[PDB]
């Protein structure tokens, strides 16, 4: 279940953003819609979908059996194809296109409002759950470098009937 990860990166001459995959990267400071199927060719590396608790979707053949090639293999894709959590697994997804742009599809977990639960001006960036906060998941720093200074809190969020205990990154 690590083979599944899609790992195609080019090129890092400009920014060395790629390092972000392994550890914190010296990004320059400061520069700071449905979901279906994405080909594994343009994906480096992990794809994060939110329920809204963050979840990892690995490569699978279309459709839908999992592939343990690093994608790599041409058939490898990510099947998202999803509907909001009352009732669905996730609101939206974020990943990195191979050149190092961040691709977001679907909608942020905040969207439940309504209103006033999403950020004040609405969104180009991130899985917000609060005008000030977004979800914290292991590749957030890599996906959203601007959030490096964000404080982290333990947070309850209720979707439909289910209750999610999740970590949040706030201003």
């Amino acid at each position: 279940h690590i083979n599944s990860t899609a790992l195609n990166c080019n090129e890092s001459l400009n920014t060395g953003w790629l390092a972000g995959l392994f550890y914190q990267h010296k990004f320059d400071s400061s520069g700071c819609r449905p979901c279906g199927i994405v080909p594994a060719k343009s994906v480096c590396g992990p794809v994060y979908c939110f329920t809204p608790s963050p979840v990892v979707v690995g490569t699978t053949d279309r459709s839908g059996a999992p592939t343990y090639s690093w994608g790599a293999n041409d058939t490898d894709v990510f099947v998202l194809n999803n509907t909001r959590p009352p009732l669905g697994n996730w609101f939206g997804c974020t990943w990195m296109n191979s050149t190092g742009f961040t691709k977001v599809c679907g909608a942020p977990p905040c969207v439940i409002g309504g209103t006033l639960l999403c950020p004040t001006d609405c969104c180009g960036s991130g899985p917000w759950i609060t005008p000030r906060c977004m979800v914290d998941y292991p590749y957030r720093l890599w996906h959203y470098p601007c959030t490096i200074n964000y404080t982290i809190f333990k947070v309850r969020m209720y979707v439909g009937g289910v209750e999610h205990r999740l970590e949040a990154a706030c201003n």
Partner: antibody
Framework: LLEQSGAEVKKPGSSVKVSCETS????????LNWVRQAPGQGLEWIGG????????RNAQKFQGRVTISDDKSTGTGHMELRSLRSEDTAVYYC????????????????????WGQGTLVTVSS | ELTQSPATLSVSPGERATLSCRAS??????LAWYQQKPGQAPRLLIY???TRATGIPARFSGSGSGTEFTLTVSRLEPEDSAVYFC?????????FGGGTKVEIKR
């Protein structure tokens, strides 16, 4: 800042184990590669490993035997080469890389940032 | 798959020493220049064909793309007495250049 194991002599067909240590360790390195240098000829790439994915990659001349293990705990690298040849006699460099430029997958590619002291491996009876 | 020319260079201090690297197959910008001083391990001079590494003086200057590369040492100092190598990180097998030995004239 990268220290390698002391020079060794082994009979043809035997095995060598060369280590690597970092003082002070451990820093952010994503890949551990090895590059040997025969006195007659220029540098030759042996192989490498990215410890985060556990994916190894070698060259045709060493495809069968060599295994490179990178321990992240103590930041200690290891290259073991078995069934040595007379042309295997060279100065073996331990090299580590920070900042990838390309990933085929699993393996990642980048320039070599830090080299080791070098280890003279002598294959002689 | 890398050809460094010339094999041997000899040049006065304060003058420019240029080294050519030619790949048999295109390697885009995935080329790196290293310096090997007598009895020491190689030092990373340039990566990405023309990007200087940290701590390397501006007199060192990488150039070129595709199959065609050149390394420039503008203001030579006796410390530059070393053998310089080129190495590509593009194609499946990693390859080094033959290596150019640089002699400082005095």
């Amino acid at each position: 800042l990268l220290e390698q194991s002391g020079a060794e002599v082994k009979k043809p067909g035997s095995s060598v184990k060369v280590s690597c240590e970092t003082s002070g360790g451990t820093f952010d390195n994503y890949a551990l590669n090895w590059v040997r240098q025969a006195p007659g000829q220029g540098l030759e790439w042996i192989g490498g490993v990215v410890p985060l994915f556990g994916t190894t990659r070698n060259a045709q001349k060493f495809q069968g035997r060599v295994t490179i293990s990178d321990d992240k705990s103590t930041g200690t690298g290891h290259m073991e080469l078995r069934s040595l040849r007379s042309e295997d006699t060279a100065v073996y460099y331990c090299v580590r890389s920070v900042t990838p430029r390309y990933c085929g997958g699993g393996f990642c590619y980048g320039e070599f940032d830090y080299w080791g002291q070098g280890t003279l491996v002598t294959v002689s009876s | 798959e890398l050809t460094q020319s010339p094999a041997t260079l000899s040049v006065s201090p304060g003058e420019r020493a240029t080294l050519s690297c030619r790949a048999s197959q295109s390697v885009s910008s995935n080329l790196a220049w290293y310096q090997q001083k007598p009895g020491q391990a190689p030092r990373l001079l340039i990566y990405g064909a023309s990007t200087r590494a940290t701590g390397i003086p501006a007199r060192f200057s990488g150039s070129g793309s595709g199959t065609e590369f050149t390394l420039t040492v503008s203001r030579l100092e006796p410390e530059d007495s070393a053998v310089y190598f080129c190495q590509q990180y593009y194609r499946s097998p990693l390859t080094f250049g033959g290596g150019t030995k640089v002699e400082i004239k005095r």
